[PDB]
Amino acid sequence: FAGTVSALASIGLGLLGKSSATPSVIKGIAQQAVGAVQAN
Amino acid sequence: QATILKPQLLPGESVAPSGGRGTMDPPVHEICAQSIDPSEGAVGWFYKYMDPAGAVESGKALGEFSKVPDGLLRYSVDAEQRPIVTIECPTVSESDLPLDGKLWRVSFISFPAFRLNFIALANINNEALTLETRNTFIQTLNNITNWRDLGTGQWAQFAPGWYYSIYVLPNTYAMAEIGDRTDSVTQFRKVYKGITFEFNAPTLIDQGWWVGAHIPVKPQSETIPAAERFSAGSMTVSASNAIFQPSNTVARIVWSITPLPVATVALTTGTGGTNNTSGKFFSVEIDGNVNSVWTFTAPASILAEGEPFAEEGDTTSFSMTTITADTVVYSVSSSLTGSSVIVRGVTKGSGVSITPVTVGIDTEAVNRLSIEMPALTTEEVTTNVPKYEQFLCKESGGAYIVHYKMNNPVFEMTGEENFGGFQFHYPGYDPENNALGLRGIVDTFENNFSSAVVHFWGISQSATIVCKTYDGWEGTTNAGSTVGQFAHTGAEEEDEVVQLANRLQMELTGVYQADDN
Amino acid sequence: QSIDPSEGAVGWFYKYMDPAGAVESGKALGEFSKVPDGLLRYSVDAEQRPIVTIECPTVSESDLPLDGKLWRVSFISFPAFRLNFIALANINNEALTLETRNTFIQTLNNITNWRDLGTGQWAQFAPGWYYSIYVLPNTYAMAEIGDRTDSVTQFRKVYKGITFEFNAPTLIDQGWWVGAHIPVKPQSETIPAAERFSAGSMTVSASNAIFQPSNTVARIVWSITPLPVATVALTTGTGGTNNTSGKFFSVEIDGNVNSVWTFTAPASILAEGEPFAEEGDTTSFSMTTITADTVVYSVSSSLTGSSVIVRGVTKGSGVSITPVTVGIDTEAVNRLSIEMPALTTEEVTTNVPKYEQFLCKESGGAYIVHYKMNNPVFEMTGEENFGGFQFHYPGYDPENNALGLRGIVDTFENNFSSAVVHFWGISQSATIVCKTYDGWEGTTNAGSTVGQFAHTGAEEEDEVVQLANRLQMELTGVYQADDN
Amino acid sequence: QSIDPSEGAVGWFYKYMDPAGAVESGKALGEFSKVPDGLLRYSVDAEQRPIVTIECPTVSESDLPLDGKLWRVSFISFPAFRLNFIALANINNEALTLETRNTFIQTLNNITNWRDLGTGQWAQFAPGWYYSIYVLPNTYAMAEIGDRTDSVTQFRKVYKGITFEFNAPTLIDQGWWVGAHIPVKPQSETIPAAERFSAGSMTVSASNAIFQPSNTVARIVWSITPLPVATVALTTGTGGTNNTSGKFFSVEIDGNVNSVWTFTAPASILAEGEPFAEEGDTTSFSMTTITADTVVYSVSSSLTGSSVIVRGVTKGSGVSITPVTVGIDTEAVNRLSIEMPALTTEEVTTNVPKYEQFLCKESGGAYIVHYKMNNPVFEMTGEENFGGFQFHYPGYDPENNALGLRGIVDTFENNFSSAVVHFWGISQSATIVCKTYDGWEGTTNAGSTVGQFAHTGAEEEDEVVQLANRLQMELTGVYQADDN
Amino acid sequence: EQATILKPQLLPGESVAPSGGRGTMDPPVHEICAQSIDPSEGAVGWFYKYMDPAGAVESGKALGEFSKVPDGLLRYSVDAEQRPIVTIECPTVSESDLPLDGKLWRVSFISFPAFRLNFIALANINNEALTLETRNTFIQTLNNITNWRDLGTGQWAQFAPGWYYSIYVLPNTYAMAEIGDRTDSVTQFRKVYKGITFEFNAPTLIDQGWWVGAHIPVKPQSETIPAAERFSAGSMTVSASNAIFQPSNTVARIVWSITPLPVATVALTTGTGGTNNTSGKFFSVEIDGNVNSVWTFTAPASILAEGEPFAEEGDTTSFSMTTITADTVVYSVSSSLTGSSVIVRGVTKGSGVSITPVTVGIDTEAVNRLSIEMPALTTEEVTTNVPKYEQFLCKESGGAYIVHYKMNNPVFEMTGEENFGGFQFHYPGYDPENNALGLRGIVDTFENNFSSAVVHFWGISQSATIVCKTYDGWEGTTNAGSTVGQFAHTGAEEEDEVVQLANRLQMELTGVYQADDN
Ligand SMILES: [Ca+2]
Ligand SMILES: [Ca+2]
């Protein structure tokens, strides 16, 4: 349970699980997973 | 709408004061919608992939449009080459009248190839192509030796009323294939490729029409053996005619030799008129009269008709005994005493004369790519293709062609797999007429994209074609890559769009008018 | 949105799913032969349903002897463009031993002018073994640059459905079978193109000529790869010369030892570091000894100083290769190293878990539905992997491979799984009818006839395609014939 | 309930992601070696977890000296079937001269029986440089032609990912590295099949022997391209031999200029266009000279009038090759031209952006994780691209490439990043433990053992995979070991 | 606040045909609206990069096409970063064992805002004080390098006894061949920023070491190598040394090379080997060996030395060593020329190189060399003469991190071809006599704008090394054959509004920092 990279999955996999399943949406989570953000 | 920014450190990553990565995924300016948020690159790409030339001057181009939005590559370099070539009739057909109502035919083959743009061949006379006519053509493109020394876009006679030239893509072509300085990238994809064939004609005699149609072609790596002590080769003497001088007097044969090393051919005994390559293998461009004789020191041992002909330190002398206004007889002569002379019958503007040679030179193995020359027939295309379009050049101020991910439903990464010596086969065409060694075009062929051709017909000697091409390639750089310094993260997968595109494309004809550019 | 798919995309569905039943269930709608992946801007989709009557190698077609004797017959189906499938049979229900196996293989790779077996007709290849090939008419029809020539820039099987109906009198309506799909991609092992001379090999298979004194006569089919087709005619003795339509040199003959066949060399030849003939010599091939088991042969020519040639070939199994060099030239043309789908009823089980097996009595035969197994999408299979495939397999020694352009030359579907079906307890008094609904979709480059049929590639019907290979997946590509 | 992937997906996802944390985090569950793309009827998924402790070349795995000396070690993981990666090294702290790297490569392009190297044992190709080949056991274990002879049709790497733990005592952690995934694809440059005489070549790589007279005694690796393997042994002189296991001829031996080993020809051989020796004739090999940088080798044939060989070879440099020609028959096999993933710290950092460098001390090693980097979807490498790994690179000229079936013989996983991890300035006294969690999915054609656990393909779970794919294109694939 | 501007593809009023017009579109400008300005990321990004070329990226400030100086000067431009990372290591004397409580080295770096070239290394194993002789021996060397690309591999190179240096180039730019057959480069160019972090790769404890860094400007004033025809005069150098693991007393290595003379494949004719060849276009070769060993090749062009005809287009000249000691060596070059003379010459291994003046029967391309006054080498010469420097113990700083900046000019005047050359180095106390004639030395264009730097390290345990993670940004204007024209497009807009800061900011501080602040 040291995997960071792994956490960075279950985090998004986590979302996905209750996410609209849109591949567009997937992009969303997939960036959130990397912990990205909307700057300003 | 809004901008996105990913962190160097992944949630939790604990880097040192100089660790991490050295990059910073350029921000995401993906635009927004009720259902999707493609990034300007994703978007730009869509339009570019769709209407390359237009979408740009259309203003709809933007962001990493030269990158494909299918979030496949973790990192990738990419760009677009917009080389603009002006194709125009080869023969300065001298006319006495004030109105040389002459017309010429011309056709272009587009290959979604890494370094190659498209091919083109015209007929000074508007005559169509004959089988054997066509064949010579073909066998010529297979026999082209130091092909690189042709990218200049220069015209080249192969048939009587026929010439042909090949156009590279300025930079990718500007990336050599030698072990010393330049080697390609690990692989790539033709992100989108379009060409406009502007009908540059005097708005006086704007006659003519053209047919365009996309045809997919996948290459076949019919590879060449790696030789050691000796290597098999082919001595080529494609006899031709002096674009100006008297056939029945002077000939213009091109003389190359498949695996034998490039060695300067200086005309010694004769009248004069030579132009040798710079390619790695030995080839020559020379025109002259009978008595004339060129020379050169044979880089390596050479056999032929069984018996040895030359040795490293030998000096070969090539001449021509007879020059009918259409046929040509020639002689090849070795220093090496005990050897006998070589002679052979050719026919300028016709097939080449082959000479199963053998060169005392280690031979790197390299594949040759067996590629079916797309319907070149005035009217074959018209048949095997329903999605072809066609109008008069007058109307459609030219032709607009947009290639597309034709072969694979999705965008694979055509890599080194299919790379090599283009060697075109076709129906009715005999390969026996195919030159040996690694000659012909050499390039990585985007096996995903749609190859495609467009023949112009019934135009005027005066009318010329400005081919504005927009080639968009993306690939992964390895080493020595003079480009690796441009690669960033690969486009994000926005299939939402992508699919649409694919549909359109499919749904559409990759051909349009240079007025819909 | 209803998820409305073109009625023709639906056709494709069932067709892919159940290429045979779909037709029968009328569910065969629209131009079902085009793949709804919305890929091609245009394309030609075709579907040949060629039917073959498989009889037991020796058993007549006329009279059906109710022997109450049996025979093992298996078929290997390949998603090859024109090649429908291959079938091999043992007139004694026997097992496929190694040599037999290897011989079988060996043969297929050394099949010179393979077009010579376009005819479903059998061909002994071992002591009690025969094999034959089944081409897909319409495609096989596509003469590779002859007089009548059309062409396709690339294609992809849209589905393949073969159903080996167990045509056996209910009387001895016995035996069983095992079917299974095994995906195989080919590798392009190249046959270097050459000039003044071209290396090659002179093969000479030998085996008893059904209906001739076993120990006396022997039917043999000897060929010579780069050597251009030569017209052989018996020169002196007991008749028995069947020639080839082929482009290279091959001929099947039979006769007394003293019998002699001869033809003129259409190009200079070399054998055992030595010369053998000029482009005009009169080559003479005959036999020295004929054993119901073995056979010695020897060929010579009018070439002055031309030594003779001699080697032996134990009748029924393998060929006597002869390293040769021909005076003509070769093309780049390469063979296709292709793994050979488990030929033993053994491995098939021990390797394919989604394989099936029923008795031919209940399961009126065996019906298999080929499917895109190779890659998750319907990639286009073009030129890239076309060539004379030569199957390799454990045990099989490449040594036995010819040297020229041999074997079944065709294109392989870089996607569809190949499948094999072994019938075991069949009664010679039974024949396996083979319904073959196989439909490909490709693109034309040059031709005078096919073009006019090319329209638009089926629209991207993502939703269907989706489930499509989803089902095929969780499903055994094998099925009870009667379930077609 | 948006979607419910079965464990085998999750477990997979997490693995094709953090193949270490997956397991470590117990997140790896279900039959995870199968890609939930749902493309197979049946498939055998598998995960080989080799843990090799890549110790410095000249080091005692026993009483390691707390030296404080350095050494470069670059790992170039390839998504090959039974090939984990290659290990580059350099005891003397020296850069990779073109000479050097060109020597390196050629070594790997001319490795006679690469199998003889599976031991991953160190091999000195250059004065201070070594290499070695670590393999994915279990697969490699399945003997190529085998005894139970299990044969896999097609496969596909489902997830590479391996960590290169920086095994070093706080005393000496002086170390820093940097990885990066660079995709690679093999272009099948085919080796032709010939008949009576097939060409090949004779290689001889000379170098000094560990703990031996750097000018009095030198070790070479003499081999022959298409030559059938034959046993050698010192005949007269200072002992020192190591025979090959492969089907071709090669051997490693140490000794002085007086030392002479010999073996008997397995078949005819021509050399310098001259019959060097026939079947019987016993060939001898010795050294006219021996220094610290050069060696004159010379092979004497038992043949009568058989002129012998004499050759200069700078030990530590390339391999001096003598074109050959054996009387054996050869099957045409495929050599695979393959770009060599940037071998230089800079070459890598400037051309690849998604690289990630670290100080070993802080980053407890390195952890790279490959991923389907070519096909946007998991196609299925099979026979498709299998052969002799023969690499090139900028600079490298094939002028020094072996004519025979050499190099690393395997199948390169078409679509999948091959990566590189360079460890610079590592303590002599430190090693790299390499636990790779490699997994693949394939199909069985013939075998007796593998086709048992062959089951159904993974259930097509897009979203899952979809995401997985997003994260990849998204990531670096190179992380602090502390992140596995 | 955010904003996105779009420059139409047309101009107000332009009536444009479909087919034609402009072929390139303008990448959309994204501006960060500020209460006083709204630069585009390609600015900020730059800004930051230019300012902290590493920490700006590690931090998350490297936005857009930051490799483009925002000063609306170029219409079109090519931008690109290069982050080569070499791990300069101690050189090799021999597997000569190594105790931790023992040996260590001194290694210095000189970084020049040169287009292709990255930085020049230099180290002394036994840890030495740069003696005058040592210096010259060095400089003379760098200069007399024939096919400078020959070592672009960033491989160590000896010269003085126990002294080695090396050259590291911008892997991608070095990758772009010069004056090659059909090869050439960009039109102009200008470093957009460039910093280097010499991470201190040292064992946690043997953290011993101290380094100094400082920015010192240097501009190349060019001197020319005149063209000629019948024969182009030049000279052949031959330096000496003892290969590694080599009996220094009787096995010497030499960097024998002739200048205007064409590379001619050198081949060992007799005796032990020890011979390396050069890819470059000029005759250069590296051989070593027992005294009486012989080398050779076929003299490509008419050679005349010692005022005497020495060779012809075909003669085969060979080089053998008369007497080789563990310090000095006497060599001999013999012509296969009918009654030619012979060249007996001797050189001191660890120092200097024998220049035998020659004249080659070959035409020459006039190409000038750049008189670039080499910067500091004297650890204390810096400290004293350059105020804005910073010294640190590696123990208390993971290393050094320097960052340059247009110092030579307050503006960013594109430093085109105007100063291209195989720059030989100039230094206080160096005889330009040791200089090689012909066009040798490292070839390249020098950013006639940026400050060059130097960063000497001492007391670095042999076992400790230095990872030199660099970040060289630059933008030029491509012309023809450029393998980059594609990556070209619209120039950066003028953000002097910001630029200014950056300038007066840099100057505000040193260019030297801690390798833990990047
Ligand atoms: Ca593919
Ligand atoms: Ca100025």
Tab-separated table of C-alpha atoms in Angstrom, chain C residues 74-232:
chain	number	residue	atom	x	y	z
C	74	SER	CA	-9.884	-32.937	-40.360
C	75	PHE	CA	-10.219	-29.470	-41.754
C	76	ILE	CA	-8.228	-26.376	-41.052
C	77	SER	CA	-9.992	-23.143	-41.863
C	78	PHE	CA	-8.049	-20.032	-42.534
C	79	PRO	CA	-9.284	-16.502	-42.878
C	80	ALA	CA	-7.286	-16.409	-46.091
C	81	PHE	CA	-8.577	-14.226	-48.886
C	82	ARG	CA	-9.275	-16.881	-51.488
C	83	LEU	CA	-8.268	-19.943	-49.510
C	84	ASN	CA	-11.411	-21.356	-47.961
C	85	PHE	CA	-9.765	-24.118	-45.954
C	86	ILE	CA	-7.678	-27.255	-46.051
C	87	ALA	CA	-8.743	-30.790	-45.293
C	88	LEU	CA	-6.695	-33.941	-44.722
C	89	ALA	CA	-7.880	-37.534	-44.435
C	90	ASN	CA	-6.742	-40.962	-43.263
C	91	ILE	CA	-8.521	-43.836	-44.990
C	92	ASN	CA	-7.942	-45.974	-41.865
C	93	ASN	CA	-9.282	-43.642	-39.216
C	94	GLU	CA	-5.649	-43.645	-38.123
C	95	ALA	CA	-3.916	-41.173	-35.899
C	96	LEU	CA	-1.710	-38.467	-37.302
C	97	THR	CA	1.794	-39.541	-36.303
C	98	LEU	CA	4.760	-37.177	-36.389
C	99	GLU	CA	6.184	-38.044	-39.853
C	100	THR	CA	2.643	-38.270	-41.199
C	101	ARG	CA	2.091	-34.904	-39.553
C	102	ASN	CA	5.354	-33.427	-40.723
C	103	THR	CA	4.861	-35.006	-44.170
C	104	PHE	CA	1.450	-33.389	-44.339
C	105	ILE	CA	2.965	-30.074	-43.414
C	106	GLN	CA	6.050	-30.615	-45.537
C	107	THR	CA	3.764	-31.114	-48.511
C	108	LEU	CA	1.658	-27.965	-48.040
C	109	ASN	CA	4.799	-25.861	-48.005
C	110	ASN	CA	6.218	-27.551	-51.050
C	111	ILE	CA	2.983	-27.403	-53.019
C	112	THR	CA	4.500	-25.865	-56.133
C	113	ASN	CA	1.720	-24.474	-58.315
C	114	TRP	CA	-0.767	-24.778	-55.484
C	115	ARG	CA	-3.361	-23.482	-57.943
C	116	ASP	CA	-3.233	-27.068	-59.215
C	117	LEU	CA	-5.347	-28.187	-56.276
C	118	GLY	CA	-7.916	-25.456	-56.758
C	119	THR	CA	-9.999	-28.500	-57.633
C	120	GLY	CA	-11.384	-29.881	-54.407
C	121	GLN	CA	-9.974	-33.262	-55.440
C	122	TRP	CA	-7.771	-35.082	-52.924
C	123	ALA	CA	-4.067	-35.868	-53.203
C	124	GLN	CA	-2.325	-38.652	-51.321
C	125	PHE	CA	0.472	-37.354	-49.158
C	126	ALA	CA	1.204	-40.250	-46.845
C	127	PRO	CA	0.746	-44.035	-46.512
C	128	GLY	CA	-2.956	-43.658	-45.792
C	129	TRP	CA	-3.253	-39.917	-46.059
C	130	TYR	CA	-4.765	-37.483	-48.506
C	131	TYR	CA	-5.370	-33.762	-48.389
C	132	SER	CA	-6.907	-31.151	-50.594
C	133	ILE	CA	-7.673	-27.511	-50.695
C	134	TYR	CA	-10.821	-25.514	-50.808
C	135	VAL	CA	-10.704	-22.223	-52.458
C	136	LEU	CA	-13.352	-19.555	-52.331
C	137	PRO	CA	-14.558	-19.589	-55.960
C	138	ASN	CA	-15.230	-15.948	-56.730
C	139	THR	CA	-11.951	-14.849	-55.079
C	140	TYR	CA	-9.841	-17.743	-56.298
C	141	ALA	CA	-11.323	-16.563	-59.585
C	142	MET	CA	-9.316	-13.387	-59.207
C	143	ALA	CA	-6.545	-14.453	-61.594
C	144	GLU	CA	-3.334	-12.807	-60.338
C	145	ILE	CA	-2.432	-10.735	-63.455
C	146	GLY	CA	-3.258	-13.174	-66.279
C	147	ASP	CA	-5.584	-12.167	-69.114
C	148	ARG	CA	-8.472	-11.304	-66.869
C	149	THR	CA	-7.195	-9.307	-63.892
C	150	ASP	CA	-8.880	-7.273	-61.142
C	151	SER	CA	-7.409	-6.406	-57.754
C	152	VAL	CA	-7.975	-5.416	-54.142
C	153	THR	CA	-5.829	-2.942	-52.188
C	154	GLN	CA	-6.799	-4.564	-48.900
C	155	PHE	CA	-9.540	-6.414	-47.146
C	156	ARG	CA	-10.767	-7.934	-43.969
C	157	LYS	CA	-12.979	-10.951	-43.509
C	158	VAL	CA	-16.348	-9.725	-42.332
C	159	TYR	CA	-17.041	-13.210	-41.014
C	160	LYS	CA	-16.585	-16.834	-41.921
C	161	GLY	CA	-19.002	-19.591	-41.250
C	162	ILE	CA	-18.377	-23.153	-42.172
C	163	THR	CA	-20.649	-25.960	-41.268
C	164	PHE	CA	-19.441	-29.484	-41.931
C	165	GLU	CA	-22.740	-31.247	-42.253
C	166	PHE	CA	-22.320	-34.890	-41.283
C	167	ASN	CA	-23.639	-36.451	-44.503
C	168	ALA	CA	-23.738	-40.101	-43.453
C	169	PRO	CA	-26.382	-42.746	-44.032
C	170	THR	CA	-28.168	-43.031	-40.741
C	171	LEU	CA	-27.154	-46.717	-41.045
C	172	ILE	CA	-23.533	-46.147	-40.031
C	173	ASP	CA	-24.422	-42.671	-38.848
C	174	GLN	CA	-21.491	-42.912	-36.502
C	175	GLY	CA	-18.313	-41.194	-35.423
C	176	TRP	CA	-17.547	-37.905	-33.663
C	177	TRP	CA	-15.653	-34.651	-34.040
C	178	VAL	CA	-13.884	-31.787	-32.307
C	179	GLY	CA	-13.806	-28.194	-33.353
C	180	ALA	CA	-11.899	-25.248	-31.971
C	181	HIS	CA	-10.620	-21.850	-32.979
C	182	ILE	CA	-6.995	-20.932	-32.775
C	183	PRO	CA	-5.925	-17.449	-33.865
C	184	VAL	CA	-2.759	-17.322	-35.863
C	185	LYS	CA	-0.857	-14.420	-37.324
C	186	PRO	CA	1.698	-15.130	-40.057
C	187	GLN	CA	5.244	-13.900	-40.383
C	188	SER	CA	6.682	-12.934	-43.760
C	189	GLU	CA	9.728	-15.131	-44.280
C	190	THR	CA	11.068	-13.722	-47.572
C	191	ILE	CA	12.166	-15.500	-50.722
C	192	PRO	CA	14.840	-13.088	-52.016
C	193	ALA	CA	14.414	-11.862	-55.564
C	194	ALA	CA	17.414	-12.664	-57.771
C	195	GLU	CA	18.753	-12.029	-61.270
C	196	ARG	CA	21.043	-14.106	-63.552
C	197	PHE	CA	20.450	-17.136	-61.397
C	198	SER	CA	18.015	-18.085	-58.737
C	199	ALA	CA	18.488	-20.746	-56.111
C	200	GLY	CA	15.697	-23.286	-55.841
C	201	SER	CA	14.972	-26.974	-55.199
C	202	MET	CA	13.762	-29.961	-57.173
C	203	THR	CA	11.126	-31.766	-55.181
C	204	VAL	CA	9.862	-35.213	-56.006
C	205	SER	CA	7.184	-36.769	-53.854
C	206	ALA	CA	6.391	-40.460	-54.413
C	207	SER	CA	3.458	-42.730	-53.510
C	208	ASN	CA	1.432	-45.691	-54.855
C	209	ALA	CA	-1.009	-44.835	-57.637
C	210	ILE	CA	-4.390	-46.047	-56.410
C	211	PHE	CA	-5.393	-48.815	-58.821
C	212	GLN	CA	-1.875	-49.891	-59.919
C	213	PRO	CA	0.451	-52.744	-58.780
C	214	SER	CA	1.647	-51.437	-55.424
C	215	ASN	CA	5.195	-52.756	-55.792
C	216	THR	CA	5.245	-52.178	-59.556
C	217	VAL	CA	3.909	-48.691	-60.223
C	218	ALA	CA	4.093	-45.480	-58.223
C	219	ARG	CA	2.407	-42.106	-58.671
C	220	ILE	CA	4.779	-39.253	-58.044
C	221	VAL	CA	4.600	-35.487	-58.397
C	222	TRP	CA	7.964	-33.921	-58.929
C	223	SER	CA	8.540	-30.210	-59.326
C	224	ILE	CA	11.345	-27.648	-59.692
C	225	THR	CA	10.644	-24.190	-58.078
C	226	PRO	CA	12.283	-21.296	-59.973
C	227	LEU	CA	12.172	-23.432	-63.123
C	228	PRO	CA	9.351	-22.065	-65.350
C	229	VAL	CA	6.479	-24.382	-66.064
C	230	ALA	CA	7.681	-26.952	-68.520
C	231	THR	CA	5.307	-29.180	-70.444
C	232	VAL	CA	6.140	-32.738	-69.562
